[PDB]
Amino acid sequence: MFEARLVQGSILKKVLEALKDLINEACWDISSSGVNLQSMDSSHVSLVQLTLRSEGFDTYRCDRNLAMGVNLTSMSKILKCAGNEDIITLRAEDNADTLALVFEAPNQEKVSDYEMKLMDLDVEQPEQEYSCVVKMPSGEFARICRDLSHIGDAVVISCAKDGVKFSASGELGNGNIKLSQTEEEAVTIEMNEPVQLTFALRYLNFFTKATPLSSTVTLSMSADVPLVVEYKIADMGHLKYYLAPKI
């Protein structure tokens, strides 16, 4: 059996709001260390990697390792039936067709319990050091991507020790945003060697749906390899987006 009890159900809600639009079905790897998810989008352009530590759950139990095939859209609809202050408990048997969700509403005066059908999915499957790493406010990054979406299709991210630059171009003109280095409102840069890559704003605007998960976001960049957009899930783990560059 697998039984995880999380008092901050809002985390779960936000996570699925952050994943449902980029990937529709994903395989949940359940292990003694926690719940991991790793899936590529349908177009094979970005990769999503979610890590939820077992120690971040208020109670955790996992007899054998599990691979739950979850349709993320359905689980998103069901989690819409959970209040932000609800205590959410996931529970699934080993030879289970279904995953059970329990919403224990704050006021021990309401208890919802839903049952979701699973699918036969089967699993898919390294950490690096990057030339340039930018730590900046998450809402700021979301704003930048959304605004440059009005200007062009792709954003050119240039990373140096004196700031980070996003640039876009389109038929009505072009734009350049420069963020200079300056605790949760700060922009700090760790630079190994300068970088410059180009990415599709569509996918970044998919990634920024995870903004309610963290006040800060980090971008890891290296020449000719995918970009890493990382949102720390406080006390629980992290949510990572990998975007292949344009070449």
């Binding site: 094979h44 352009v45 390294p126 180009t198 390899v225 990998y242 344009k246 070449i247």
Partner: peptide, 11 residues
Amino acid sequence: RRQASMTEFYH
């Protein structure tokens, strides 16, 4: 500028 896949890198 085309789009490279994820399947070329980590594959």
